[PDB]
């Protein structure tokens, strides 16, 4: 994503419990221990993108470098709207079966998910999302992977 500045707000943005003002300098491989950027692994065969570990953005809702755990259903869909800030709308299509006439009909539903600044998402792309705790009035899913374009 494209973000002009990291600190552009009333308060100071920082990861909680990451101490940044130490007199002695010690170099360590651990992410959060030494005083450098913290990140985790979601699991379920999902790989951390390179942009997350080396980026400077601060986000408390991103599945990477954030305080949200992913558990529950995993769904797929196509994005139809990307005109909010860090939020997208996906469309899911399926077929309902009418027993009397022995044939199906088309139906669809709309879903809202949170998109992290690590990914770059455009209209008409397929994405994979995972369930999380309620983050808003109508946001209960988080973007995990962006499939390659044709």
């Amino acid at each position: 994503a494209t973000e002009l500045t990291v600190q552009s707000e009333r308060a100071f943005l920082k990861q909680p419990h990451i101490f940044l003002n130490s007199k002695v300098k010690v170099k360590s491989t651990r992410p959060g221990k030494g005083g450098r950027r913290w990140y985790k692994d979601v699991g379920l065969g999902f790989k951390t993108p390179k942009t997350a570990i080396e980026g400077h953005y601060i986000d408390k809702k991103c599945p990477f470098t954030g305080m949200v755990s992913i558990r529950g259903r995993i769904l797929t869909g196509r994005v139809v709207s990307t005109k909010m800030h860090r939020t997208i709308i996906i469309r899911r299509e399926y077929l309902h079966y009418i027993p009397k006439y022995n044939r199906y009909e088309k139906r669809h539903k709309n879903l809202a998910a949170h998109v992290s600044p690590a990914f770059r998402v455009e209209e008409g792309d397929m994405v994979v999302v995972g369930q999380c705790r309620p983050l808003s009035k109508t946001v209960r899913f988080n973007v995990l992977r962006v499939l390659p374009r044709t």
């Binding site: 009333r10 308060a11 100071f12 920082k14 940044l20 130490s22 007199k23």
Partner: protein, 201 residues
């Protein structure tokens, strides 16, 4: 009383919902308590499950911890100087979480004098009104103190200037309405430059 349910809202399609049931014992809310700087005054409240919470109405002192050094001393709060959310919080001198305040620096300076055998922030030498020396009752202490001073290092100039006046900047990191205590830490480093630039401009 106050309720925090979502029944009274409007659905995401714009439709208006209908009445479902009367208000429940849960989903309630309570009147906010506005903490102020003054003599101590605290009320008890009986919450869910038989537990208790502590409403703080007026406070004047609390714990503040120095990050780099690692000491925690109790001191008093002089006044509120900045609040990222609302200006009326600053003017009223009412304190909540993430409020920048000013605290007395006397307890922290004294510990530095004992731990390190060097003076910290003394420009009264021009007046020399309160200059005084007490004979140090040992000689092994210089070996111990000079080792500490040469190892840990020196304070940065930004924090040293505040010690001359005797006032230090801090941020409240507790929730006085919930726990009834005002606690925080001394802010320093890059975070100091952000607030100092914002405070006077």
């Amino acid at each position: 009383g106050i309720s925090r349910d979502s029944r009274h809202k409007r659905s995401h399609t714009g439709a208006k919902r209908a009445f479902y049931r009367k208000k429940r014992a849960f989903e309630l809310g309570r009147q906010p308590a506005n903490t102020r700087i003054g003599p101590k005054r605290i009320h008890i409240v009986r919450t869910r499950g038989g537990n208790h919470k502590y409403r703080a109405l007026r406070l004047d002192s609390g714990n503040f911890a120095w990050g780099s050094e690692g000491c925690t001393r109790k001191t008093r709060i002089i006044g509120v100087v900045y609040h990222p959310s609302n200006n009326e919080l600053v003017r009223t001198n009412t304190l909540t979480k993430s409020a920048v305040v000013q605290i007395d620096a006397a307890p922290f300076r004294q510990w530095y004098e004992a731990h390190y055998g060097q003076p910290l922030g003394r420009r009264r030498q021009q007046k020399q009104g309160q200059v005084v020396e007490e004979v140090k009752k040992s000689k092994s202490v210089e070996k111990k103190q000079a080792a500490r001073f040469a190892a840990h290092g020196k304070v940065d100039p930004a924090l040293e200037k505040q010690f001359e006046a005797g006032r230090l900047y801090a941020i409240i990191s507790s929730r006085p309405g919930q726990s009834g205590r005002a606690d925080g830490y001394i802010l320093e480093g890059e975070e100091l430059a952000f607030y100092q630039r914002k405070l006077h401009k």
